C-alpha cells in the first residue's frame, strides 16, 4: 500500500525569484569628474613650466660652450 510519489514543489513554496532590472547608479558626479580633470591638468602645466624653463637654461649653457669653442 504505497503512496503516490511524484515530482512536486516543496510544502509551502519555493523561494522568491528576482526578475526586475537591477542596474545600479555606480559613479561620481559630473562636477567632481571635471574638477579632478582640471586639477590634474593644472598640476601638469606647472610641472612642465618648471622643467621647460630649466631646459632653456641648460640649452643656453650648451650654446655658450660652443661659442667659447668656435674661434
Amino acid at each position: 500500500a504505497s503512496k503516490v510519489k511524484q515530482d512536486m514543489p516543496p510544502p509551502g513554496g519555493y523561494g522568491p525569484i528576482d526578475y526586475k532590472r537591477n542596474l545600479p547608479r555606480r559613479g561620481l558626479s559630473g562636477y567632481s569628474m571635471f574638477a579632478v580633470g582640471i586639477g590634474t591638468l593644472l598640476f601638469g602645466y606647472w610641472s612642465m613650466m618648471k622643467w621647460n624653463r630649466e631646459r632653456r637654461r641648460l640649452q643656453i649653457e650648451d650654446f655658450e660652450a660652443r661659442i667659447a669653442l668656435m674661434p
Partner: protein, 54 residues
C-alpha cells in the same frame, strides 16, 4: 497569451512589454523585458504544479 489564452495561461500573471518608436532598439528592449516576464511565469508555474496524470 492575454487575448486568446490557451492551456493555463489565464492563471498566470505577467506584463506585456510595449514599444514606442517601432525601431530595433524598442524591439530589443521588448525582448529583454519578455525574458524577465518569462522568469516571472516560470516562478508561478514552479509554485503551482498540481499532481495527477500527464
Amino acid at each position: 497569451r492575454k487575448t486568446q489564452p490557451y492551456d493555463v495561461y489565464d492563471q498566470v500573471e505577467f506584463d506585456v512589454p510595449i514599444g514606442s518608436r517601432g525601431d530595433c532598439y524598442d524591439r530589443y528592449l521588448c525582448r529583454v523585458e519578455e525574458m524577465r516576464q518569462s522568469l516571472r511565469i516560470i516562478s508561478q508555474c514552479l509554485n503551482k504544479m498540481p499532481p495527477g496524470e500527464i
